Design a protein around this nucleic acid. Sequence first.
RNA 1: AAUAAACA
Lengths: 116, 285, 378
Amino acid sequence: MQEIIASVDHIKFDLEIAVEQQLGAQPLPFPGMDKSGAAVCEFFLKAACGKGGMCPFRHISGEKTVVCKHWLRGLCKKGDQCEFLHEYDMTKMPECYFYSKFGECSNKECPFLHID
Amino acid sequence: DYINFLKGVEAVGSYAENQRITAVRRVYQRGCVNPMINIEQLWRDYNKYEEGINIHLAKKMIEDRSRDYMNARRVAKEYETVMKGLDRNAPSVPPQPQEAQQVDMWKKYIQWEKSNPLRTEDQTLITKRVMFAYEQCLLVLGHHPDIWYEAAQYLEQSSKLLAEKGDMNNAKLFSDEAANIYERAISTLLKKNMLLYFAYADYEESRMKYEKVHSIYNRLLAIEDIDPTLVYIQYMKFARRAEGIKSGRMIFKKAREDTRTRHHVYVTAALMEYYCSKDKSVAFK
Amino acid sequence: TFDGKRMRKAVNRKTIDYNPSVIKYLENRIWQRDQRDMRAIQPDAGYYNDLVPPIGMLNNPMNAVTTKFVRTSTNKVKCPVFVVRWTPEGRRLVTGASSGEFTLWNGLTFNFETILQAHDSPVRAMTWSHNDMWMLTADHGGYVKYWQSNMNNVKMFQAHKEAIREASFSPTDNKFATCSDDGTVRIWDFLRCHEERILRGHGADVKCVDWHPTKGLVVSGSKDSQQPIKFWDPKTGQSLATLHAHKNTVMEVKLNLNGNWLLTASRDHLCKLFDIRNLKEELQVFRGHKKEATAVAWHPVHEGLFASGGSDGSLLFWHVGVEKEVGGMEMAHEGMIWSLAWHPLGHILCSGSNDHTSKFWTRNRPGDKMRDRYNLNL
RNA sequence: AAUAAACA
Ligand SMILES: [Zn+2]
Ligand SMILES: [Zn+2]
Ligand SMILES: [Zn+2]
């Protein structure tokens, strides 16, 4: 099980040190980007982050109750100015447009919400 | 005469008139690619037919096929030179001065169409034009074996050339056409001429249709006044080569039982056993 | 109109799934040591399990002769597609049309994923990076955009006062080159959008640009018969060489990823190999395009073989060392082929016409009969 | 919400 014999839980690697204070992440070019594939910056949640707009990692805001439908396929033009959420929790999806308006749905594995 | 006939066909309404316009246009577009004498006049009638139904759209339809016409008009002037020297009316006579001088003008006309004046990679457009050059020459000098032989060898050459570049269904179309031009020689004009049989026998061995070959060889043996001494050599030379030693001796069994046979098949058969089956005693017996 | 708001029935889709082939190779390569150890894919329809991707059969590159048709992929506005690229994930397929639209077509099962109004001009050029990060595009107008993987619109800039026709990219995110119809090849800074240098002295409109995968060589092709193929020197700006190859109008120029072979499409019915370390002689030419050869794409996991478009829509497949072509579609892809793009796994090929369509081409299945209208019309 | 369903 790899954690009885060669355990590494007591090691503070240089890899984990490289990703807390982010170890020299360059302020990203072209300010109309998306910050995609980037997780979060802990400098923004605790205090002031330091750089605004042109920053590598993601800046989150509150009052996002519905996850983004475009974002699942991998097409997020909005990025962090998105009015929708970017998690993977299967409880904050939109209502399905064809179950809410047009009676029943069509496909068998519709992820979107079906409420009555 | 087919342009004026389609105009003569009575059509009432608008859809049947457009059926007339479609039918006359198709023969126009096909005929203005074909090299001939009065190609400058067909295009002149083409210009007046396009302007005769719609002047505005005539400026585009003439222009869209004009560049291919300029290739067709140029090669038609190139086609005048080799065709003005030929006779195209002489009866078919086997060689006996002027006759051999006529052959040179045919071999020029064959190899000039082999030189591909319409420079293209499409071997089907290349071959059928050379095949049209072959069929015109077989009318005038059909009793010549070389014109029959250079016909189907060009088809055997065009068979393996189309077998490489993807066109597989048309490779066998020219391959059976290669047997067809050989068939027309032995059936229509040159029945006692041995050379076109063996070209047709060795073509079918190259197509590996070995059962067909024995029908070809025995067709020649049914002909009364030939010398089968040469044929039994080659019909033994097929059986050893394609079917084994024992199949060869069955042929040499048939060579002994034919009255017309002379001494040369007895020379060949002992050399077929010694050089191939490596036996001295059978070659001695 | 089309907005995903009206309901449609449930349908199963034509799937070309590489996953049962790739899984098969992983199970194979454990106990396979070579291709001389491979179990044969006997020609029957029952041997649909034993397909491995073209990495599985490095030997025998005739695997990837993709003549089996899959799916015409047409839009609803009917514009002729010019450039075709796969996302380097093999996930989708952005495609450029004359109205300036990027229709992202699916990969395993092809549907449609989104439309874009990218360019104000007909799209002419499209390349990704060596990592999946940045996509480069260009058009008839002179504008070059950067694109992400999620197709975000980035800062755009007028690279040329006349119509760009290509853009290829250095082995990094630092440098690339766009040639246009003013006749120059301008090599660009990636990040600053800064005009590094102009490579003048060419004569007429240059319509393709290649970049050598290591050595830093910009190769070009031309309509100008006096200066048809120019090698360049990107750091200095000087003409390194000149190669007189074609009678007219070199269309598309592609180098291998192994770094040796130049390949050149041209409007004189020819594709030609040039070893770039010996420009005095000439390798084999490729004859068989009955009209002009307008699009060329090297195979990814097979060096040696490539597909070659035609202006009659003829789609032919070649191989280095083999004189005549292997695959064949004639009067079959209808129109004038502008570009080709293999899937990253070299197992399914795309196309694109001057007619308004853009077909997809997978490998021939085992033991089927090619009675299809592309292969044998009978 | 910016093409989720873009169908033969
Ligand atoms: Zn931040
Ligand atoms: Zn989003
Ligand atoms: Zn639903």
